[PDB]
């Protein structure tokens, strides 16, 4: 849910 996950997946 954090942005790092949402942007890199």
């Amino acid at each position: 849910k954090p942005l790092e996950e949402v942007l890199n997946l």
């Epitope: 849910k1 954090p2 942005l3 790092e4 996950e5 949402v6 942007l7």
Partner: antibody
Framework: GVQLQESGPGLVKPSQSLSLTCTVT?????????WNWIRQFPGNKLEWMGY???????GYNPSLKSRISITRDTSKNQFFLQLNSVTTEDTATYYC???????????WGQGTLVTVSA | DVQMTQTPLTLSVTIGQPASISCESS???????????LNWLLQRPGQSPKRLIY???KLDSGVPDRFTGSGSGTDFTLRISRVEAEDLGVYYC?????????FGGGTKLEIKR
Amino acid sequence: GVQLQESGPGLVKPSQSLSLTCTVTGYSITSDYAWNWIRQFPGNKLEWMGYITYSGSTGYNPSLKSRISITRDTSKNQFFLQLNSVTTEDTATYYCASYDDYTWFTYWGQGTLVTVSA
Amino acid sequence: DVQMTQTPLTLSVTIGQPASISCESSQSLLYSNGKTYLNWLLQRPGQSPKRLIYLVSKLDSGVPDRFTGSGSGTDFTLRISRVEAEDLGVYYCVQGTHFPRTFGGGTKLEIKR
């Protein structure tokens, strides 16, 4: 190098649709990062409203989900905020901002004041 | 929603003296990838917020080394080793671990003079 700029009306009538524009220069909104809308209320209280990712997915604050929409124009390098059914409680300064929370890249607009009044 | 408590409300400090702000999160901001997403913003009067610290302790480009961020779990701290005139403004912390992103009430820094 990068610059974000908010534009749109300063005065909106209650129940109408608020429509803001964030114009971006110096970077493409299709490349990377999350592109956010944040508003500050009188008293200095900040509220994250929502974002659109570089890929086009959207996240909305659950308190707004019902009446918030975020879109983009990839040819103009702009993203937009549409907030329906505005009340006087929606009077606030609206910022657009770009970040990712794990990288150095971070940029805020200068903000634009929106007054909801009759 | 995770709520963030800032202390103190305001803060009056003489130029050259230290200062620190606390931010307590209701829940652990430690995420399942070992990273903790807590940032610090400074809003100078009449200007828009600017990020100082991210990932707890990392300095943003342009930020003087006078600024130090520490903490973990629920307790976090921002330390200004030596206050200068242009440190004047309102400081916020913000968490980007739990949806939705939430901010602290802010801490106002005044210059004792």
